[PDB]
Symmetry: D2
Subunit: 297 residues, 4 copies
């Protein structure tokens, strides 16, 4: 096989305090993920508000995850994608330099490359580092889809591309992927359907919910990897309400709202154009939260 | 909620024509082939059976043939009986019950887009008119409407004989929603490519297009799943993916009838308009996918 | 001379029910009101007239009443006569001609998803069965299929009496596509909110829901545009925008029937299942928007 | 009341040569636009591959547009937008300093802000400069929609927001917009439907096709603005084939290909993730081009 990063993973939120990244809170939150069975953390993905961080903050966030995971079996899969290939290569190289175990690389958003463009984009990225690269498909945000054929070609042509995070609400595609190329690591990027993706041979999750409920997401994932499907589904069913409410408005608006209500971050603060949820949605999130046992620090 | 149910591996039967006429001999023969290959129920005159272009008497006849042919076996008959007019859907359900069907499959009203309130009243009226099991059938790509999860669960709870839903909506999230909130219902896969994922989440059957051609493979998949042998179920589901997709290269049942003709299982590649033969190109694509599969004869 | 066509401002008639039956006296009176308010043609038994839930006998009664009421006036009857079964659509087409219809509106097959080749043969069968004008009707959100621009153009060119299409697809790109490649056809708006843009691009009429309530406004709009008085046609389209949207807050004809009842134009708010009354919330929403419009009486 | 930029406008392609911006070609292309009746030019929009340009190349393009338009009545509506409000604000001021007459600012892509966030996003942009701001809605690329209510509110609350470029294939929305706020400048961002948008009160276009056929786009627009709808439609009808083929692959892949095929640029290069179209699409574009009279220099 190739070198891989799988298991229960968390797309880390990035707490702000008075506009500034709260780096002490960020380290604390990672330790909390670590203590609750999480296998890897994903600094500066979509959930971490990658769009609104400076390059230096981006790098710092990776550094913090790296430093915090040292001395543990937990890995850092650093968010490093861009819709400009030169920037994506740069971010990938930095991530490798700061000691990341691998990178998560979102499909170019907004500029809608063709399948050929996506292929050359990821081929260029994979060639720039000797560390694992997980592709990330999320057409609702990007405006483009990495097709199954392109994913499979990338996996077969590039040594370090080992799988894809799918956030596309398409279980047919998930079947297509693993039926034609069962060696790849399919990763769930959609919490509500973690179980179905794992039960089809998916080997991990990159989760939003796990920011709030890491013990539950890790237990779910580990049961499925142990083929204890009954237990995995049970947790998946249990988590459905919170998994959905965490998307009542665009992620990470609801998850930051939950983390704040839980006393886990200090300030319900975003960077524009993101902002507080509506009062209605704030109330729904707080209400759904009452059904769950939330781990403290 | 106890209810009486029809679950397991089920086939949405194609309806063969010979010179425009329903070939009833061929129909009975096809059903026997399903039976001998381990199928649990058959669905006469659903979408796959060209329900839209059969007369009412042909519709009744097909249900009748299914019931009679399945006599002397464990195989159940889940009769297609839906309509976008509530009075007709009720009439159809009543017919199905009188002809001895074990249950009915009742598609959401197509074309006229009833609201969720209307869907609830529609199905409640159907459900109240007969005491046999009713399976809801959601297929928004064909009907132009969606029975919401909330509407489905309400119907399941409020009407004793409504026991589940056939979903053909490519929506595994909804499948989770359904069974997480109401784990007593029978979720049935109406989409062959994703049979295994639905069953592994607690689905209890399939109503299959592919099983017309490969009943033994669809039956084995389903039964492996029900026995919690997920490895084997997934293995068959992965193997079938290619045939599962190509059977929808044009609108169902155009490809499956083409495959049945190519396999020598039906005599004539005939439809009733507005359905018609596939393109020569799709004809050849179907033929070449079939070659990767071992197709049971009579 | 002139090619035989039915165009201008046209109304998709609601079918009023009294105690479960077609209110015929109401029906005739409603058509009379359309006639007196500048309408060029009426459409009995379309989507808006709940065609799906009417019996064949009721379909007849509505068409006859329409024919009798327009008789001696310039106003034409473009009768609904489509089906997802070609043998039925042919029968319905002949049925409509024989009852005195000037032409037919024939919806694309719903639910069974014919291919473009199927649609072609479907409509060719229909067109050859009668000698009166045939208007195609594309509404993919309801039928689950699309008559492609290519298929519409080939049907228009190959069949004499197919003279155009009613588009209800929210797709102005297609409307440009149609009239750029085949400018001889009659593109008819089946979407009230965008009546003007369709007409400003060369469309030759509308088949309107809103005209049930405000026939004088819709006909004036259509005739301004037909006269290349685009400023005035737009002005009316703009002020009708609110009522045009609210009449679709729930599936048509649920809102338009609510509005007609509210206006005192029909005497019973009755639908046939699966259609039913709107929510209290939408009822009040409809009642409010109406307050901004001058509604003609009888 | 409200300074505006309307009329026939071109979303400029950015020619690359040996990986670099071809500054001489850029200038020559703009002159050609000017000489063919165009009312404004949009440097570094989507069609100009904004995503993959550096800040310095961005500056260079605007400066070249401004310098080349000097002494003409032709205006420079600069691409200046981002999915991070702080950057978007910075780009807006940066465009003003470099002499842009106005800015085109696209809805935040990828991070999917809420309508409340969109409102705050644009209000911050509008209040940071004193030149006209045109909103740009293109949900297929951004993954979000600026609602009619949000557009009208921004138009009414912020002095310099004067209109919106719509690329949403939604004439219903165009009706809604101009029915409720007929004072705004609705600008077509979808070449195929230029005429229907203009005939409903639209006051201009920001065109892709005008790169290749500027004389035709300008006449269409000016005919329409003068209420000669017959002539405006006639041209829109004739352009339909080319308007569609120029989107056979994602803009600007086809238009830059067409310009090269036409002999109007000397190299055909994109920045990854963009690339040349398929061989068969090269052929398709070429066949469609043969039906039009393409102005030289």
């Amino acid at each position: 096989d190739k070198n891989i990063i799988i298991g229960a993973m968390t797309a880390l939120i990035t707490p702000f305090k008075n506009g500034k990244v709260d780096e002490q809170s960020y380290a604390r939150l990672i330790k909390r993920q670590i203590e609750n069975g999480i296998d890897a953390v994903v600094p500066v993905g979509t959930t971490g508000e990658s769009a609104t961080l400076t390059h230096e903050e981006h790098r710092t966030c990776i550094e913090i995850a790296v430093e915090t995971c040292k001395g543990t079996k937990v890995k850092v899969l650093a968010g490093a994608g861009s819709n400009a290939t030169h920037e994506a290569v740069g971010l990938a190289k930095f991530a490798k330099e700061h000691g990341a175990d691998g990178i998560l690389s979102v499909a170019p958003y907004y500029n809608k490359p063709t399948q050929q463009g996506l292929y050359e984009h990821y081929k260029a990225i994979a060639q720039s580092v000797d560390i694992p690269v997980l592709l990330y498909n999320v057409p609702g945000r990007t405006g483009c889809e990495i097709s199954t054929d392109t994913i499979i070609k990338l996996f077969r042509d590039c040594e370090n591309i080992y799988g894809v995070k799918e956030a596309s609400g398409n279980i047919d595609k998930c079947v297509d992927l693993l039926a034609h190329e069962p060696r790849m690591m399919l990763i769930s990027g959609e919490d509500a359907i973690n179980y179905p993706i794992l039960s089809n041979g998916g080997k991990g999750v990159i989760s939003v919910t796990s920011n709030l409920l890491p013990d539950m997401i890790s237990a779910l994932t580990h049961f499925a990897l142990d083929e204890n499907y009954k237990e995995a589904k049970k947790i998946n069913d249990e988590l459905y309400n919170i998994n959905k409410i965490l998307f009542c408005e665009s992620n990470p608006i609801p998850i930051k709202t939950a983390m704040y209500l839980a006393g886990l971050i200090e300030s319900l603060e975003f960077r524009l154009p993101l902002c507080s949820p509506s009062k209605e949605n704030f109330a729904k999130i707080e209400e759904v939260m009452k059904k769950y046992k939330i781990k403290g620090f």
